[PDB]
DNA sequence: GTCGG
DNA sequence: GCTGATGCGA
DNA sequence: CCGACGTCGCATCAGC
Ligand SMILES: Nc1ccn([C@H]2C[C@H](O)[C@@H](COP(=O)(O)C(F)(F)P(=O)(O)OP(=O)(O)O)O2)c(=O)n1
Ligand SMILES: [Mn+2]
């Protein structure tokens with residue numbers, strides 16, 4: 401909260417660059433600045449004090465000066481009051497509608513929720529589901545329900561095969577008081593690098609009516625919707641993602657999947673330096689051959705990082 | 716947009 | 721009908 | 731000054 405004004409404004413600029421300008425790297429830049437500034441222990445008194453930090457350059461420094469002087473930002477008010485831009489930004493809030501479809505809808509007059517309803521015919525399945533649950537998906541999931549979902553998912557998985565192991569990862573694993581969704585890392589002895597496991601887990605979860613809709617399904621990833629059962633006399637629908645990972649790659653998998661997204665980018669970068677390439681599966685030398693992983697701490701050892709706990713990788 | 720080369 | 725590239729998201 | 735900037739899985743539809 402300490403520097404929320406700045407970071408909120410950077411995050412908003414980041415989103416504009418992604419959704420409207422379709423400039424992914426500028427998106428990345430603002431998010432980096434925002435991340436660095438959120439890790440800064442002091443209260444930012446000037447743009448130049450900000451500019452000392454890596455990721456914060458000339459332009460952002462100016463935008464910080466204006467923000468601390470005016471309380472607002474000229475560039476954003478423009479964006480906010482601009483019909484197209486404000487419209488594109490709103491539409492991308494629908495799961496399945498990104499910068500390109502949003503802009504295409506808008507160019508053809510489809511610019512509000514109603515318009516999407518008026519035009520269901522023009523939405524793919526995933527978009528239709530994002531529409532259907534637009535409200536629910538924007539809600540947070542308080543840890544107490546996360547644990548309630550955790551319990552139901554491990555249980556149903558056991559029921560399929562006692563040798564499954566499911567680790568809920570994502571912000572839950574970082575110990576967050578609320579998460580955006582449920583991310584589930586799944587492994588099984590039958591399946592390794594050398595070696596329908598996912599379909600069976602999904603099918604079972606569909607049968608007890610936990611999973612209610614499918615966004616995408618493959619041999620290793622399921623993206624769908626779920627919902628805790630309530631008193632017979634309704635919980636909001638939630639996004640759940642299940643990843644099937646080869647057992648001997650669990651620790652890389654769970655590193656990736658625990659995040660944060662920025663942690664992962666800061667790690668893969670700060671390992672790209674040291675001659676490693678970290679993906680959700682392996683860690684290779686600069687390239688290359690998959691080194692022995694045996695713990696998460698194992699990955700950190702390699703790239704020379706003081707092992708950070710999950711609750712500390714939220715950047 | 717930022718920064719190392 | 722098929723499929724790469726484009727899109728969207730983890 | 732310029733251009734590189736993490737790394738993946740699944741679905742969709744143009745252009746044939
Ligand atoms: N661009 C990305 C996005 C995600 N992830 C990895 C790292 C993430 O930990 C993991 C899940 O991403 P998520 O889409 O469920 C998330 F990010 F929103 P989460 O971290 O879980 O916070 P919450 O969902 O509660 O809002 O995928 C990544 O490596 N790169
Ligand atoms: Mn200091």
Ligand SMILES: [Mn+2]
Nearest residue numbers: 570571581583
């Ligand atoms: Mn998540």
Ligand SMILES: [Mn+2]
Nearest residue numbers: 581582583641
């Ligand atoms: Mn997720």
Ligand SMILES: [Mn+2]
Nearest residue numbers: 693694695698
């Ligand atoms: Mn060991």
Ligand SMILES: [Mn+2]
Nearest residue numbers: 722723724725
């Ligand atoms: Mn294809």
Ligand SMILES: [Mn+2]
Nearest residue numbers: 716731732733
């Ligand atoms: Mn340039």
Ligand SMILES: [Mn+2]
Nearest residue numbers: 743744745746
């Ligand atoms: Mn056609």
Ligand code: NA
Nearest residue numbers: 492494495497
């Ligand atoms: Na979207």
Ligand code: NA
Nearest residue numbers: 717718719720
């Ligand atoms: Na420089």
